[PDB]
Amino acid sequence: SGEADCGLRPLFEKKSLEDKTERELLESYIDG
Amino acid sequence: IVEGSDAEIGMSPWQVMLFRKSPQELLCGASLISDRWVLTAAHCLLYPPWDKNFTENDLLVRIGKHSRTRYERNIEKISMLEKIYIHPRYNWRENLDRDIALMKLKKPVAFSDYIHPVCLPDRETAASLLQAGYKGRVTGWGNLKETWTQPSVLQVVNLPIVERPVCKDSTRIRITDNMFCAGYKPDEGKRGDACEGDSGGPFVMKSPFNNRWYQMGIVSWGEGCDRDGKYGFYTHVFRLKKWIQKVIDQF
DNA sequence: GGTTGGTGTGGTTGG
Numbered sequence: 001s002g003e004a005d006c007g008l009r010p011l012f013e014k015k016s017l018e019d020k021t022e023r024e025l026l027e028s029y030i031d032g
Numbered sequence: 033i034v035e036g037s038d039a040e041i042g043m044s045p046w047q048v049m050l051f052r053k054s055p056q057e058l059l060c061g062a063s064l065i066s067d068r069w070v071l072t073a074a075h076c077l078l079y080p081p082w083d084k085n086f087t088e089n090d091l092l093v094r095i096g097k098h099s100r101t102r103y104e105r106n107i108e109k110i111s112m113l114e115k116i117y118i119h120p121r122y123n124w125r126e127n128l129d130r131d132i133a134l135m136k137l138k139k140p141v142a143f144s145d146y147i148h149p150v151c152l153p154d155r156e157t158a159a160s161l162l163q164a165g166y167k168g169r170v171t172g173w174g175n176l177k178e179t180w181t182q183p184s185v186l187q188v189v190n191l192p193i194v195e196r197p198v199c200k201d202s203t204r205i206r207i208t209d210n211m212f213c214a215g216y217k218p219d220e221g222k223r224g225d226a227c228e229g230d231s232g233g234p235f236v237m238k239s240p241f242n243n244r245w246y247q248m249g250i251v252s253w254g255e256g257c258d259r260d261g262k263y264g265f266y267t268h269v270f271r272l273k274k275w276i277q278k279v280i281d282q283f
Numbered sequence: 284g285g286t287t288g289g290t291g292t293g294g295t296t297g298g
């Protein structure tokens with residue numbers, strides 16, 4: 001029963017901008 | 033948060049502060065999951081051993097905050113609780129099994145650049161993301177160091193999930209299916225952990241399918257803070273998701 | 284100061 005717009009940050013996703021250390025999160029998925 | 037860094041403005045817009053009304057003390061973390069509902073660790077509200085049994089009128093909840101102490105004028109929004117719902121089968125006696133609690137707010141909070149709700153995972157998302165070696169994110173205003181050895185702004189740290197084998201043989205405390213640990217192994221070079229005053233604080237991962245953020249964990253317990261061989265434990269949000277929906281729709 | 288630190292052509296915000 002997820003909320004319509006949840007999990008999308010106004011100052012990041014909503015502006016196609018990435019935070020300082022979110023790439024680290026993605027790397028984990030690949031060579032983790 | 034131990035060995036983390038200062039968050040960026042709006043990095044974690046679902047991050048919520050449980051604030052004690054009398055006196056003024058930071059209690060715990062929490063996360064905003066709608067405009068009316070907030071999620072936290074149950075041991076933040078009800079832990080008899082420490083003589084903690086708070087109720088709606090003991091606590092307000094602060095949203096949109098970054099600075100730990102200052103009232104961020106024109107940024108933060110303060111809300112009062114309508115009701116609290118500690119999980120029925122919450123075992124505070126033994127091992128904090130089912131360390132989860134919901135809170136409805138009197139009036140719905142408005143969303144801004146600093147206030148936005150997080151998503152709860154589902155069958156598929158939990159299956160995909162919640163796997164060993166896969167890193168999540170922890171945020172809180174808790175202690176920078178272990179008790180026997182506090183930040184000025186919200187602290188963030190990225191921490192890899194750990195397999196139950198290594199997760200169970202780490203502690204003498206009985207584990208359940210409603211938990212998972214996270215943190216670096218002693219050889220892994222990088223280190224870091226949640227600490228005291230981080231409970232309720234969300235453990236989030238970012239879906240690489242839809243670029244949405246999902247709250248996979250709640251900060252529950254530890255054994256010191258960031259010591260080799262020890263890992264922080266988190267409430268498994270999905271395995272309790274059935275309970276969460278129940279509570280919302282009924283109330 | 285303030286429901287709030289430190290130092291402002293604010294800042295994540297007035298005055």
Ligand SMILES: *[PH](O)(O)OCCCOc1cccc2c(OCCCOP(=O)(O)OCCCOc3cccc4c(O)cccc34)cccc12
Nearest residue numbers: 102105106284285287288289290291292293294296297298
């Ligand atoms: P609105 O526009 O209706 O009303 C807002 C106007 C009120 O302005 C201020 C009131 C109080 C404080 C400040 C302020 O504080 C900054 C403190 C740190 O700077 P400092 O300690 O170095 O002080 C600056 C040095 C010069 O001092 C003064 C300058 C002008 C007037 C006075 C005064 O009347 C008494 C004492 C010192 C000074 C920053 C800006 C505005 C206000």
Ligand SMILES: *C[C@@](*)(O)[C@H](CCCNC(N)=[NH2+])NC(=O)[C@@H]1CCCN1C(=O)[C@H](N)Cc1ccccc1
Nearest residue numbers: 126127226227228229230231252253254256257264
């Ligand atoms: C309430 C939270 O602030 C806090 C978070 C723990 C952070 N630790 C790390 N490094 N991950 N939780 C606690 O302090 C919990 C609540 C009750 C006691 N407790 C502990 O962490 C104990 N040290 C361990 C424990 C005791 C009894 C039952 C389960 C665990």
Ligand SMILES: [K+]
Nearest residue numbers: 105287288293
């Ligand atoms: K000011």
Ligand code: NA
Nearest residue numbers: 215258259262
């Ligand atoms: Na550790």
